Amino acid sequence: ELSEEDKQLQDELEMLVERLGEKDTSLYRPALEELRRQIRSSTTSMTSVPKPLKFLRPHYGKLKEIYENMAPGENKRFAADIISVLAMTMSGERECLKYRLVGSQEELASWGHEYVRHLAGEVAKEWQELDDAEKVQREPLLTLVKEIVPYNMAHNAEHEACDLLMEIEQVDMLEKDIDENAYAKVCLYLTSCVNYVPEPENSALLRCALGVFRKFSRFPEALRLALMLNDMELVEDIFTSCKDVVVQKQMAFMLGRHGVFLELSEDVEEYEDLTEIMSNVQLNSNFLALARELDIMEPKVPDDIYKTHLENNRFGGSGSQVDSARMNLASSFVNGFVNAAFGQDKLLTDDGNKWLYKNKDHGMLSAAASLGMILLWDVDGGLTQIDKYLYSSEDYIKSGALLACGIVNSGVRNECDPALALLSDYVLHNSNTMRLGSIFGLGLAYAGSNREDVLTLLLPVMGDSKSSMEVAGVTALACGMIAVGSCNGDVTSTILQTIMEKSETELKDTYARWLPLGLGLNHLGKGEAIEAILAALEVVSEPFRSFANTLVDVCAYAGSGNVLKVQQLLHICSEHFADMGAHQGVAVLGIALIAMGEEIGAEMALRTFGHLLRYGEPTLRRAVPLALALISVSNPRLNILDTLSKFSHDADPEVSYNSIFAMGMVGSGTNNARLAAMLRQLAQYHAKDPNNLFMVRLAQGLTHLGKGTLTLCPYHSDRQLMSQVAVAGLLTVLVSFLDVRNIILGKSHYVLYGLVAAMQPRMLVTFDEELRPLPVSVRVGQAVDVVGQAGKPKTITGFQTHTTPVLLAHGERAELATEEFLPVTPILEGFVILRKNPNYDL
Amino acid sequence: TKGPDAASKLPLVTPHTQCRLKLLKLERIKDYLLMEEEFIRNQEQMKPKQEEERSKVDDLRGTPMSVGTLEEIIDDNHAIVSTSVGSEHYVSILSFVDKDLLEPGCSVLLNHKVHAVIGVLMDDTDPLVTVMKVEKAPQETYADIGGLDNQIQEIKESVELPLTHPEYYEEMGIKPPKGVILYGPPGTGKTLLAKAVANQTSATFLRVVGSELIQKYLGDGPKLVRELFRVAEEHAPSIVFIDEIDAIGTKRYDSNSGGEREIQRTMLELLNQLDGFDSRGDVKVIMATNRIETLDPALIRPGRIDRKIEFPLPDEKTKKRIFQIHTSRMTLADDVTLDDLIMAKDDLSGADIKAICTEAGLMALRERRMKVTNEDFKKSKENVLYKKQEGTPEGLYL
Amino acid sequence: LREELQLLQEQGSYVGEVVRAMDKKKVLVKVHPEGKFVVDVDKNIDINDVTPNCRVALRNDSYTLHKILPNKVDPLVSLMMVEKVPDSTYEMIGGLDKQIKEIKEVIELPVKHPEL
Amino acid sequence: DKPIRALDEGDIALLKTYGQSTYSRQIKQVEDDIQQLLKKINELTGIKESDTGLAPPALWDLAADKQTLQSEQPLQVARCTKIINADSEDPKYIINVKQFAKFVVDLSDQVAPTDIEEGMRVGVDRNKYQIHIPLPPKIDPTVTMMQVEEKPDVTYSDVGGCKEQIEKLREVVETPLLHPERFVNLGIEPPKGVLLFGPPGTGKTLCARAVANRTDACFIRVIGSELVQKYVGEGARMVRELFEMARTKKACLIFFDEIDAIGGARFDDGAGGDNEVQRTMLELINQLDGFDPRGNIKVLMATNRPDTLDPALMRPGRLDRKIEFSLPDLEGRTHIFKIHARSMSVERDIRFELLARLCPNSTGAEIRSVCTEAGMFAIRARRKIATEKDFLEAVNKVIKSYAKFSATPRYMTYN
Numbered sequence A: 001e002l003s004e005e006d007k008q009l010q011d012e013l014e015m016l017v018e019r020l021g022e023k024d025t026s027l028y029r030p031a032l033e034e035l036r037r038q039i040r041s042s043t044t045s046m047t048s049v050p051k052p053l054k055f056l057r058p059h060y061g062k063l064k065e066i067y068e069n070m071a072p073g074e075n076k077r078f079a080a081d082i083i084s085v086l087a088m089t090m091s092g093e094r095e096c097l098k099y100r101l102v103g104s105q106e107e108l109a110s111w112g113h114e115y116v117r118h119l120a121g122e123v124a125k126e127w128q129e130l131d132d133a134e135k136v137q138r139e140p141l142l143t144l145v146k147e148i149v150p151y152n153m154a155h156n157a158e159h160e161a162c163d164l165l166m167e168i169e170q171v172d173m174l175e176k177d178i179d180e181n182a183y184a185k186v187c188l189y190l191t192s193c194v195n196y197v198p199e200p201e202n203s204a205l206l207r208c209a210l211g212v213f214r215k216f217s218r219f220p221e222a223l224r225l226a227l228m229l230n231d232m233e234l235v236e237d238i239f240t241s242c243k244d245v246v247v248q249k250q251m252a253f254m255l256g257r258h259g260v261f262l263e264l265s266e267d268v269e270e271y272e273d274l275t276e277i278m279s280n281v282q283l284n285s286n287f288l289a290l291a292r293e294l295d296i297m298e299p300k301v302p303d304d305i306y307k308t309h310l311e312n313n314r315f316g317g318s319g320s321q322v323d324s325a326r327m328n329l330a331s332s333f334v335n336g337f338v339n340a341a342f343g344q345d346k347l348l349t350d351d352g353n354k355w356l357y358k359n360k361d362h363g364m365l366s367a368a369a370s371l372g373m374i375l376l377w378d379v380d381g382g383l384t385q386i387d388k389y390l391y392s393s394e395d396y397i398k399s400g401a402l403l404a405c406g407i408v409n410s411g412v413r414n415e416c417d418p419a420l421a422l423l424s425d426y427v428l429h430n431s432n433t434m435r436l437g438s439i440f441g442l443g444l445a446y447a448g449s450n451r452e453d454v455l456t457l458l459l460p461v462m463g464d465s466k467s468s469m470e471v472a473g474v475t476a477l478a479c480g481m482i483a484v485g486s487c488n489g490d491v492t493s494t495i496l497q498t499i500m501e502k503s504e505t506e507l508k509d510t511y512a513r514w515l516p517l518g519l520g521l522n523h524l525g526k527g528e529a530i531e532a533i534l535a536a537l538e539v540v541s542e543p544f545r546s547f548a549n550t551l552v553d554v555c556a557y558a559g560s561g562n563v564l565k566v567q568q569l570l571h572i573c574s575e576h577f578a579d580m581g582a583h584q585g586v587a588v589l590g591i592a593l594i595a596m597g598e599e600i601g602a603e604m605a606l607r608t609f610g611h612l613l614r615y616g617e618p619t620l621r622r623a624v625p626l627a628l629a630l631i632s633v634s635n636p637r638l639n640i641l642d643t644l645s646k647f648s649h650d651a652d653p654e655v656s657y658n659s660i661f662a663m664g665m666v667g668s669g670t671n672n673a674r675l676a677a678m679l680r681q682l683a684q685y686h687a688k689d690p691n692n693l694f695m696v697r698l699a700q701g702l703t704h705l706g707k708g709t710l711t712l713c714p715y716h717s718d719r720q721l722m723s724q725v726a727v728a729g730l731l732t733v734l735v736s737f738l739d740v741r742n743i744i745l746g747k748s749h750y751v752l753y754g755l756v757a758a759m760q761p762r763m764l765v766t767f768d769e770e771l772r773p774l775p776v777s778v779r780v781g782q783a784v785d786v787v788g789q790a791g792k793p794k795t796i797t798g799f800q801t802h803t804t805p806v807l808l809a810h811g812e813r814a815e816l817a818t819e820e821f822l823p824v825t826p827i828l829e830g831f832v833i834l835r836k837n838p839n840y841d842l
Numbered sequence B: 001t002k003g004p005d006a007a008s009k010l011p012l013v014t015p016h017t018q019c020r021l022k023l024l025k026l027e028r029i030k031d032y033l034l035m036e037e038e039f040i041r042n043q044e045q046m047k048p049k050q051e052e053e054r055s056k057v058d059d060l061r062g063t064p065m066s067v068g069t070l071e072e073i074i075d076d077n078h079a080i081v082s083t084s085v086g087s088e089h090y091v092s093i094l095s096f097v098d099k100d101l102l103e104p105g106c107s108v109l110l111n112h113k114v115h116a117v118i119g120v121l122m123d124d125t126d127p128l129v130t131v132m133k134v135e136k137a138p139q140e141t142y143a144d145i146g147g148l149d150n151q152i153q154e155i156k157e158s159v160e161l162p163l164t165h166p167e168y169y170e171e172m173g174i175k176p177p178k179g180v181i182l183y184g185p186p187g188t189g190k191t192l193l194a195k196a197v198a199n200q201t202s203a204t205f206l207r208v209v210g211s212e213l214i215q216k217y218l219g220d221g222p223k224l225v226r227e228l229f230r231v232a233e234e235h236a237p238s239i240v241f242i243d244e245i246d247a248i249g250t251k252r253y254d255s256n257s258g259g260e261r262e263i264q265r266t267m268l269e270l271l272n273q274l275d276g277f278d279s280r281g282d283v284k285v286i287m288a289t290n291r292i293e294t295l296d297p298a299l300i301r302p303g304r305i306d307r308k309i310e311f312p313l314p315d316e317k318t319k320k321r322i323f324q325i326h327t328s329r330m331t332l333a334d335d336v337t338l339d340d341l342i343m344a345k346d347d348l349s350g351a352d353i354k355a356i357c358t359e360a361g362l363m364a365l366r367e368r369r370m371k372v373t374n375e376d377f378k379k380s381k382e383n384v385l386y387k388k389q390e391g392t393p394e395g396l397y398l
Numbered sequence C: 001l002r003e004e005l006q007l008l009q010e011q012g013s014y015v016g017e018v019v020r021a022m023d024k025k026k027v028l029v030k031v032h033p034e035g036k037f038v039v040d041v042d043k044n045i046d047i048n049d050v051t052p053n054c055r056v057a058l059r060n061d062s063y064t065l066h067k068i069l070p071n072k073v074d075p076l077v078s079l080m081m082v083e084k085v086p087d088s089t090y091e092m093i094g095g096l097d098k099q100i101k102e103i104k105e106v107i108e109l110p111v112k113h114p115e116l
Numbered sequence D: 001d002k003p004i005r006a007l008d009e010g011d012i013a014l015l016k017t018y019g020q021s022t023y024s025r026q027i028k029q030v031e032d033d034i035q036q037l038l039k040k041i042n043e044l045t046g047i048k049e050s051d052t053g054l055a056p057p058a059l060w061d062l063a064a065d066k067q068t069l070q071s072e073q074p075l076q077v078a079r080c081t082k083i084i085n086a087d088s089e090d091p092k093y094i095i096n097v098k099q100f101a102k103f104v105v106d107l108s109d110q111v112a113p114t115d116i117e118e119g120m121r122v123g124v125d126r127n128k129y130q131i132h133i134p135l136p137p138k139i140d141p142t143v144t145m146m147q148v149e150e151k152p153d154v155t156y157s158d159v160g161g162c163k164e165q166i167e168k169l170r171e172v173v174e175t176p177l178l179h180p181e182r183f184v185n186l187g188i189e190p191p192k193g194v195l196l197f198g199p200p201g202t203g204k205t206l207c208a209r210a211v212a213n214r215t216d217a218c219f220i221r222v223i224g225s226e227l228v229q230k231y232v233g234e235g236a237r238m239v240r241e242l243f244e245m246a247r248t249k250k251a252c253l254i255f256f257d258e259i260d261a262i263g264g265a266r267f268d269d270g271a272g273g274d275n276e277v278q279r280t281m282l283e284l285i286n287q288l289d290g291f292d293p294r295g296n297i298k299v300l301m302a303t304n305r306p307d308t309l310d311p312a313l314m315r316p317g318r319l320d321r322k323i324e325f326s327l328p329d330l331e332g333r334t335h336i337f338k339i340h341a342r343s344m345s346v347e348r349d350i351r352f353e354l355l356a357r358l359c360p361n362s363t364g365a366e367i368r369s370v371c372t373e374a375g376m377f378a379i380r381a382r383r384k385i386a387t388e389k390d391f392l393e394a395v396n397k398v399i400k401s402y403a404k405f406s407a408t409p410r411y412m413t414y415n
Ligand SMILES: Nc1ncnc2c1ncn2[C@@H]1O[C@H](COP(=O)(O)OP(=O)(O)OP(=O)(O)O)[C@@H](O)[C@H]1O
Pocket: B144, B145, B146, B147, B148, B184, B185, B186, B187, B188, B189, B190, B191, B192, B193, B288, B289, B290, B322, B325, B349, B350, B351, B352, B354
């Protein structure tokens, strides 16, 4: 019950509210003045219970009607203020809003923080309740926001300000209202909220954050959000606005990492240095330094990688003297991938022709591509060795050499463009293998280029009726992955015409799946323009109509997180009815690629995939491991590996094959000794089937990629920056792997080399302002945010001290433990430039 | 093989602030859960073979199915099986049974009427052991532990790093530590660290009290310990946490005490499981005890327990970290200076800091305040801290 | 009366603990004097409701699980749960108002209003 | 002081409302329905079908299984206690059905009276209890699992510093077996039992593992948890059947690991004590030595607390030789360091004599822990070679960090 002070205050409140019965002149001003005074005193204090509000439980009906009849001036406004404060505690949402709306304006700050928050919530509720039928109510709510937002800004309440500004769908005022000490908080809030908000508000929020960062001149972050938006005009605007040459070099490094090559005018000083950095010619050299820091110059051999000295030699000296072709292809992939990018191998460099001569047709192409893939990012160094094998006796393997070129020029660009020159006279080659090699090399060398000359040169291949189905598919995929995430009308129209003119009998083959691929590869991350795409694709008949629609639906929403598209895809998967299950497989890959945008969505996609596996039909069971591989590329999560190990022994050969490839992709480059042991056990168990052995050895090569210093992650910048080229590469490999026997185990091993398009390295090489390497002590650990929305860089814990260059595993980041240097980019990934601290004093 | 049964956990939703970002992440979780529900509801609804297989096998075996103990395998289809009443019967082994699974002492499903071997029971796990397995991972994570960097690093190198990165251990040649005892004054973070590692680990986790592994009947104690460790072996990557090992880890000594000798037999079986004849495999053991000096040397010796992680009373930096973590969900005022609580030598532990925060919240609620102040914390310090009586000598020492 | 008589002549049903469900159609139970039995489940009884250690009832003919029944409690532990509440009152406690409020801050406030 | 006022319902409503409620209600409801949804998924899947011995369909494919079920009949196992032999024409047979009862039955016409000898176990029909089939003699399952049948990979070169202990062990468990002629010529009966005792971690179980590794005879690793049975006298019967199985094998080896478990001291002032465990220990004592000579059964026993053993068991007629494992000397500790650092990726300049001298009173297990900790230190800072400083830090972390409280100011007392 009450107290003496409480009872006296209750009596005073009751007297003040009861005096309003009649219309005496000295009632409305005195009583409302007293109520205003008490309410303001209680509300403008600590969060203590508002004692006047607790005591006040009257009815305002008489108060509302008298409001209607008495004092059209300020007294009704005082009454409105009082009833608004009273109804903030009660449930009078619309009335409580309109009391502040039409009553005494004064200011929302004069009431209290809680009153401001409640008014903000009610304003958001009304705005969501108000449609475009009338804009009369919108303007006063906007005026309320005009004062609500600065209140939150000045009282560290940026949460409510940002939320309200997202409800009203208007975010322009953040440009003119954000302070120096609060830009990071709101910017991080937006860059985290963009992933979960659906279309089209995510793009508006992204451009709002872009404008904020431009206003505060945080140019690297502006570049990050510009690549998030995937629009070149604002990237060019940021490039022009960058007046600091060190920031220019940093943004060139990040552009090269993302693979975005924008033409630079000669008006910008130091054009040559920026161009050569963006071409990423230096990377290999740094990689070499990397390797000579870890004493891993010496390349490995497949015999030691398989560890034959440990396998139980049940048949000794009688069952291993025969060298089958398929195991030779697997050993080529191993003695490639494992030793790749180190500039040397002990079996393909000194005994090349002898090795290649024990391969047949497809083995020739695979080994020729692996010869270039054993030396990465050295265009001249790679081609100096590739030319002789291009001059080979078996001119059919010439195409393979082109792959080598295309696999050597990957991740780099030259002014003279050796790849374009070398393949310009070979693209029009009538031989199917020659044209295939030419187009594949051109695509791999020019991933993400979007250069009009190469696209125009690739156009006539689609209209060539002579060109075979697999030539058409490889051409379509190369065109798509040269024009990743651009919605190029030229390529879209060309592929649409090619598929429209294609016959059903010729469409029934597996390679026709690669026709939507490039089309889909033209529309990565842009789901707005795909209504016309689906309308155009609706002309073709089912089932391939549904197949193409599903594939373009995946490609449109790559990482979008649109749960409605995932619901449609899950409905497709759950429909229990050969080619009919292709739709379900593509939809499963769609759930994977949409959910990999967000960590939460991905981890729930894990549970959905488990449910699909334990309760799905054979086609879904085959499809899921590819999805699991897509979800966690180069992220050896133990639960995923355990599920894949459980299903590697399944009685369905396709399911086991897909599970093995999922081991290879998920644990790629992590050098996981547990994964290596499990793969050795799988090789021992599957020692009889050539296909299982081939794919398990491929998985071992993938997991020993670069001796553990290479990753296939399509994500960068704390996994927030997507990579269109890498996403394209994994998409091609996975959709080809939807049919392992006909494509992977058939005539199309070269498709595996598309993963090298996604081949991106991990280091911590630190450069000075002049780009010389600089050893800096670095604190490396997990980025587990021990705070909420404090704006912290996840507050790296699990500390370990390192000297650069350093190797960072997936999910573990780094920070500068020394204040002597300041990084231009606060995200310590890849090559960075540290400016000497001017604030530090000796 | 029977790979690990890792506990399931929902993704962490951060920030923990009551903002729209938390709403969006939680609603994404709800979306995906509803997707799973819709798929799992429409799966069996659209299900239109093996039914003949079931109608034959189940009819042949019939219900109920008795559970007996295999004793001898006479022929390829005849076996001497002892029923639970201890009576042996020469019964037949039906065709639909894997002859390689039958081993002496195995649990075998028999027909109710003719007791013929109709199948083999695989698990036959003691209910007191299957309850030790953790199904719901605890919510406490490594981000909820203030300070304790050395202790967390040691426990990660022991039970976490070998699972994720066995490459270092295999390359250098070390066998990773397979036994850790978390010892120190109470309320320092031993059980909290066990909760955190259980949350983080991808391997199966078994939680023991060090006293539930003790049974009434004469031989069921060591047998229960053996069953628990065998279950840990089954799910190969395993972590066996035995809180309050003091209950059984006490030092061996000679007395009549007919129950104490069984106590010592149980602890002897435990140390045999830890390191005795035959290898232990890839199962780690985490032990916690307030008093370590009272433990038997043969239990905490290296090889059985490789690491002894000390949990001291938190220092100034650690105490400040505890206060920052445990008031993160609070709404602190501007007049609060936590430093005064962190300084002085009250010898307050992490649990003491948690109680201080809780009592400060209660003090604020007493004044009808949802935001705490410095005075509330000061009152809570004296209100809660009154634990020890004297603990100190007089003014002898200058 | 006739229905009571007819229900009476029905054989008494065994009561057995539950180790775990096995099939969504069979349950591993443990009767008092004999050992374990893998038994069928009644049509009305749902498998997702028979949890381990739940003390089901099995028919005397085929040991069919027909009732879920209340959970087992060690007879000695059940005697520790008070049924007839005592007669003491807060108004019968003198001089401990501060103590009463302090204890009720833990025994009443959290359970009644955990939202605070 | 001012008494705390009660919290009225209006106050509760205000505190739970006058604050964050824009998203608090929605967040809480979403969390609650998330928990309910998780429960729904778990319930709706909720099977995890238990594995049962269902063979692959092609394995059985037998519609004659029902024919075997109905045609063949179950037989209860019972040992023929006695032959009555009334007139050698209606002989009668007294059988004992385990614990059921004992009966006077006759054989079925299928079997011959000469094929059913006294004392063996036979199958009897469940109705007329007539003998139907002779059975092989009972072999306890757990007793046959007590055997090792899988030699561990611990050789004798992995036990450093125990040269005398190894030689005395091989003198009792290896030499009298491989080359018995070296003893009978001198008329010496070699000891038939060895008690391995010493500080924990000194290498008793390691030496037992080496013995089992190169035994070449029947090795039985007795489990101390199985001699301890629920029912009265079952542990004694366990010992009897174990010794009988050992006698069946030619010159078997038995290793009672951790003998303190069932080798306590007999007593009666405790008003009952163990009794059953004491009875099992007494039967083991009887089997070891006494009437009914044990035979060629060399017995291995290990315990790192020997002072609690029964003097009757400790008497040198059951455990004749008492090999003691002591803390290794400097040379032995150097040998242990070299053994345990053999596979490590360490430097070639490590002075292992220094490290051995830095651990004065340390068992071999502590040396292994020191090596592992040196590797851990070399891993923490990611060096691929473990240097001398890493080993010194490991020695400080393992030995000195937990040895005593003799701090450096207190350690200044010695120079
Ligand atoms: N270092 C710490 N960081 C954060 N919270 C801590 C810390 N130490 C203790 N706590 C808090 O104290 C609570 C109780 O401590 P905990 O359960 O870890 O006890 P303990 O050290 O295992 O003690 P005991 O000897 O009773 O087993 C934890 O739930 C946690 O919230």
